[PDB]
């Protein structure tokens, strides 16, 4: 297989605009949203058909109740931060928890929080400690590190529960998460050389240009991997054609364990 990830984000806004919810929690597997909850609907729902097809209603009922309390937890946490920061107005509290299952079977886990989109606190499941970015975080870290039991529980969930959850979802959406659609790669002229690739999943891809067999990272203008909106992705990389000279340029693409090369005449 490839590497797969399970992530769970929470967003809190102190002064919501009409409609803009004051709590949103969305779950992802790799890049696919699987779950969503917000302060308005106040209920948790799947965002992928294979999530609903495979999870009993009592599951959604149960986690809906949990998220309601977690939404309340988040509201209070954000208040204390704003009080600590002596901040007023609208402010954002965020938290991302998740794990990775690698190709070789090794696992990773992470947990971190952010205030106004700023790295605030980062957990370390290998030292059972928190990393504070400023004094306000350290004050929170002092308290959080007190309940040594919670840190231990954190480690267990990240290392075991998260992976078990992620493995479960991988099978549930096998036909989508574990699929592969190879990219279609073409070369253009614009005057530079555009090596474009479209319609490929998974989204992770590597593209680069070679000068007769030697890469030039500095003089290559890469494009972002954008979503085509049909379930696949697209990306491109350009290079400047030296007019006073003439070399043999070639486009190289790596995607889902396949290496592919195109050569310019």
């Amino acid at each position, epitope marked *: 297989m490839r590497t797969h990830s399970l992530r769970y984000f929470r967003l809190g806004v102190s002064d919501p605009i009409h409609g803009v919810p004051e709590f949103i929690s969305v779950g992802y597997v790799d890049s696919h949203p699987i779950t969503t909850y917000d302060s308005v609907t106040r209920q948790k729902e799947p965002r992928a058909p294979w999530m609903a097809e495979n999870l009993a209603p009592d*599951h959604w*009922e*149960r*986690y809906t*109740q*949990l998220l*309601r*309390g*977690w939404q*309340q*937890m988040f509201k209070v946490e954000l208040k204390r931060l704003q009080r600590h920061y002596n901040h007023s107005g609208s402010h954002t509290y965020q938290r991302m928890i998740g794990c990775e299952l690698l190709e070789d079977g090794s696992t990773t886990g992470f947990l971190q929080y952010a205030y106004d989109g700023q790295d605030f606190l980062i957990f370390n499941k290998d030292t059972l400690s928190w990393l504070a970015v400023d004094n306000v975080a350290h004050t929170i870290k002092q308290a959080w590190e007190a*309940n040594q*039991h*919670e840190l*231990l*529980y*954190q*480690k*267990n*969930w990240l290392e*075991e*529960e998260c992976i*078990a*959850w992620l493995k479960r979802f991988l099978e549930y959406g096998k036909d989508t998460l574990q699929r592969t659609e190879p990219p279609l790669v073409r070369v253009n002229r614009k005057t530079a050389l555009f090596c474009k690739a479209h319609g490929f999943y998974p989204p992770e891809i590597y593209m680069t240009w070679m000068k007769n067999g030697e890469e030039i990272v500095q003089e290559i203008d890469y494009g972002d991997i954008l979503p085509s909106g049909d379930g696949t992705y697209q990306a491109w990389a350009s290079i400047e054609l030296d007019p006073q000279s003439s070399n043999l340029y070639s486009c190289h693409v790596e995607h889902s364990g396949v290496h592919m090369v195109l050569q310019v005449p």
Partner: antibody
Amino acid sequence: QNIDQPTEMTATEGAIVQINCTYQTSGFNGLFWYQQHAGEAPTFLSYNVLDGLEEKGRFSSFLSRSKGYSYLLLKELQMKDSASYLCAVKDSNYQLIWGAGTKLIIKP
Amino acid sequence: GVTQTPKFQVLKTGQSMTLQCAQDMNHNSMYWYRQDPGMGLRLIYYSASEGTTDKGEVPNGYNVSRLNKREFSLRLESAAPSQTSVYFCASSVWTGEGSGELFFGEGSRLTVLE
């Protein structure tokens, strides 16, 4: 989803007793031990979520997540220790599953 | 601590009955349990946070009301002999915590009779 611990255990005053507990749950998020005297409110004793032995005073609690097994260990038993000890496990949905409990009898 | 009333009560089959429970600890989660000989505690209803309640494992014949952050009342709209038990109210700081331990009331003993 079941929790298994003995019904009654009798141990002599001043000795050591080891109350066993085995659990089979969909997920695991910690194992608790509660003390509950006759006609009294249960009270928290110990929490284990990672393997290993945790010691605090006379009481000690051991967890083996792989073996699905745990035990409360009471040292230098006192007459005041006669009570029921409740083994409870949190599952993947944070739902707390209670065992039937173990009634401990201390012979003077 | 956690205060639940009454300690004892006698009920005739078909009566209505309500158990009071309040917690001084500024907790968000509260629970109603029934403890019966032979089997472990069984949750009846639970309030994961203020303004939200859900059924537990045995929610038949019972109902609850999260009056505020402090009170969580349990009702028996019609008493039955199969309801004779000891009812414990508990609270914890939050639900979904790992090490969040429970805090129990003194317990309420009911005996329902024909």
